[PDB]
Amino acid sequence: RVVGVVVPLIHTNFADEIIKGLYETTISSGYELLITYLDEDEDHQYQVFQTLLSRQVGAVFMLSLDIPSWMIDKLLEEQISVISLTALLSEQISAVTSNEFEMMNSIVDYLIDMGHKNIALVGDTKLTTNISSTRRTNFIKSMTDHNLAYENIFLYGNDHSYETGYTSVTTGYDINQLPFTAAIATADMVGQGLINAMSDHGKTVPEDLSIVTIDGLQQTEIARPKLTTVKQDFPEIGRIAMQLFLDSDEPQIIYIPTELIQRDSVLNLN
Amino acid sequence: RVVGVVVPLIHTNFADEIIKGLYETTISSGYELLITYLDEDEDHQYQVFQTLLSRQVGAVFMLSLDIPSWMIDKLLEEQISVISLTALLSEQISAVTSNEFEMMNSIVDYLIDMGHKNIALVGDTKLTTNISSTRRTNFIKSMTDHNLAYENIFLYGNDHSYETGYTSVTTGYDINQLPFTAAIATADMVGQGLINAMSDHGKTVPEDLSIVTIDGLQQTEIARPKLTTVKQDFPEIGRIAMQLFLDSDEPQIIYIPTELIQRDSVLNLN
Numbered sequence: 191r192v193v194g195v196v197v198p199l200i201h202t203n204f205a206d207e208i209i210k211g212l213y214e215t216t217i218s219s220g221y222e223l224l225i226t227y228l229d230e231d232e233d234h235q236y237q238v239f240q241t242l243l244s245r246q247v248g249a250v251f252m253l254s255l256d257i258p259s260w261m262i263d264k265l266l267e268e269q270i271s272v273i274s275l276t277a278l279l280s281e282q283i284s285a286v287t288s289n290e291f292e293m294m295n296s297i298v299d300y301l302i303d304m305g306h307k308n309i310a311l312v313g314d315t316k317l318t319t320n321i322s323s324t325r326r327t328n329f330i331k332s333m334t335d336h337n338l339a340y341e342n343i344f345l346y347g348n349d350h351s352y353e354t355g356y357t358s359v360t361t362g363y364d365i366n367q368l369p370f371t372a373a374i375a376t377a378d379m380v381g382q383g384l385i386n387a388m389s390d391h392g393k394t395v396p397e398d399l400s401i402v403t404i405d406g407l408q409q410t411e412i413a414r415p416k417l418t419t420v421k422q423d424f425p426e427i428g429r430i431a432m433q434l435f436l437d438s439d440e441p442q443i444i445y446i447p448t449e450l451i452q453r454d455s456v457l458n459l460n
Numbered sequence: 461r462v463v464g465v466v467v468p469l470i471h472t473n474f475a476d477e478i479i480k481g482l483y484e485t486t487i488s489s490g491y492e493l494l495i496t497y498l499d500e501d502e503d504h505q506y507q508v509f510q511t512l513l514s515r516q517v518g519a520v521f522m523l524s525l526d527i528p529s530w531m532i533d534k535l536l537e538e539q540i541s542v543i544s545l546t547a548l549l550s551e552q553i554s555a556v557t558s559n560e561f562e563m564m565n566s567i568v569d570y571l572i573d574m575g576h577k578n579i580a581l582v583g584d585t586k587l588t589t590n591i592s593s594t595r596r597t598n599f600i601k602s603m604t605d606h607n608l609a610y611e612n613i614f615l616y617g618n619d620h621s622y623e624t625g626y627t628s629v630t631t632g633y634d635i636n637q638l639p640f641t642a643a644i645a646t647a648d649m650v651g652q653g654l655i656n657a658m659s660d661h662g663k664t665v666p667e668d669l670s671i672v673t674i675d676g677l678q679q680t681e682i683a684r685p686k687l688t689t690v691k692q693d694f695p696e697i698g699r700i701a702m703q704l705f706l707d708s709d710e711p712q713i714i715y716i717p718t719e720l721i722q723r724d725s726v727l728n729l730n
């Protein structure tokens with residue numbers, strides 16, 4: 191009675207919150223939780239897999255998009271359950287996640303309602319060979335669904351880091367003439383980067399830039415101004431993923447509701 | 461070949477940094493790392509221990525002071541190496557750590573050089589039945605070694621949380637008439653709580669209160685003003701500990717140096 195969790199080496203604090211949920215469901219069901227990290231080296235990846243098989247895990251919960259297909263296949267082929275959390279990793283397996291389009295669309299809805307038209311997505315916005323650019327694509331769809339045009343849509347960044355937020359409006363764009371009035375930050379720390387870059391250059395959020403972040407973890411509460419955020423229920427995602435495994439005997443996608451918490455980082459332009 | 465790491469369910473971000481160092485050393489030596497979390501429920505602790513025994517781990521690295529003695533004894537009695545990190549858990553086992561007294565005394569030295577006499581320790585300052593009040597005792601020793609008196613020594617708090625920092629100067633002392641000019645925060649988040657409580661009540665750091673934190677993780681760089689801090693080398697603690705396990709052919713304490721990084725959160729009162 192052991193389940194494994196594969197966590198990327200480089201992660202936001204979302205993982206810890208998911209783990210808290212997994213743990214409370216595992217503990218009350220008589221299972222124990224084995225946590226292992228996954229880097230980008232295919233040979234270390236295979237060792238990690240030998241660790242999962244050797245501890246005879248019943249299930250493996252995947253929190254990383256960098257999981258090689260062969261690991262998913264090999265686990266399934268050993269009759270181990272594989273479930274992905276916060277991401278749709280393979281058509282072969284079930285997933286528990288917040289609904290990405292609904293999250294993004296709720297933010298765009300709100301920003302447009304507050305009078306914003308020129309809006310940037312800042313954070314993980316890159317196109318790649320093997321990973322869907324989920325947030326970039328949803329942002330663009332939502333903006334165009336709202337009858338805005340390419341000229342209103344701005345993008346910056348390759349990851350969810352503080353530094354990406356900070357650099358976006360200092361070296362990515364001209365901080366004195368930002369061409370957008372609002373930024374959607376793909377993670378909380380990106381929002382914190384944006385706040386500090388503005389403050390460090392004689393400007394203030396939200397007067398000079400409105401910000402909404404995705405995740406709603408503790409950084410949004412300790413930021414000043416406090417950050418408006420889409421709060422994900424990471425612990426519920428963890429609980430529901432474990433429950434799915436426990437209740438199992440067709441792959442399924444379960445969407446966990448989110449909510450937009452309004453704090454102090456958005457200005458009404460109307 | 462597998463090694464375990466036992467992490468408290470409630471932890472600062474220091475654990476991930478330790479684990480980064482453990483991870484790089486385990487990888488290069490052909491071991492795999494299993495991470496497990498420990499609550500304060502003794503039955504759950506025991507179930508976990510059976511997860512360490514039955515994974516036939518070669519070593520267990522302990523990050524938490526809440527480890528029951530029976531767990532350390534049972535692991536040693538099964539010929540498993542046990543090494544504690546950042547804390548001296550038991551006289552029976554080796555430890556790798558920053559030197560606590562030197563960290564504390566480095567801060568007190570500096571604040572006194574900067575003209576401060578009335579100084580608070582804010583954060584984990586409580587006395588208990590089973591756990592040494594390490595920082596409380598070191599602060600008092602260092603202050604008195606510098607020929608300051610009990611009337612110059614102020615203490616607040618029971619843990620390393622943001623909330624403890626925030627409440628210290630709102631419920632703990634009168635924010636308009638603080639009896640100390642500087643606070644030593646026992647973790648970075650406690651410092652951030654102090655900054656926000658001051659700012660939220662119309663005050664300014666460092667003019668109205670000087671702050672120095674212990675740990676020197678990312679929050680100290682994100683804070684405005686940037687926090688003066690004693691930076692611990694958490695990855696190196698992890699690396700050195702794993703290497704101690706790999707080299708073993710009697711219990712020792714290995715101390716890893718720290719550095720006081722002077723930033724923008726301390727006023728020179730001279």
Ligand SMILES: OC[C@H]1O[C@@](CO)(O[C@H]2O[C@H](CO)[C@@H](O)[C@H](O)[C@H]2O)[C@@H](O)[C@@H]1O
Pocket residue numbers: 202204253254255275276277314324325350376377378404405422
């Ligand atoms: O941009 C979304 C994209 O990034 C990943 C991590 O690579 O998202 C994880 O991290 C985000 C920031 O903390 C979370 O908001 C998200 O829920 C989580 O999955 C990918 O998983 C995702 O496709």
Ligand SMILES: OC[C@H]1O[C@@](CO)(O[C@H]2O[C@H](CO)[C@@H](O)[C@H](O)[C@H]2O)[C@@H](O)[C@@H]1O
Pocket residue numbers: 472474523525545546547584594595620646647648674675
């Ligand atoms: O106050 C020191 C005391 O607290 C513990 C945690 O209970 O310290 C850990 O967390 C601190 C704050 O992040 C770190 O500065 C410290 O290095 C780490 O050990 C105990 O271990 C320690 O005795």
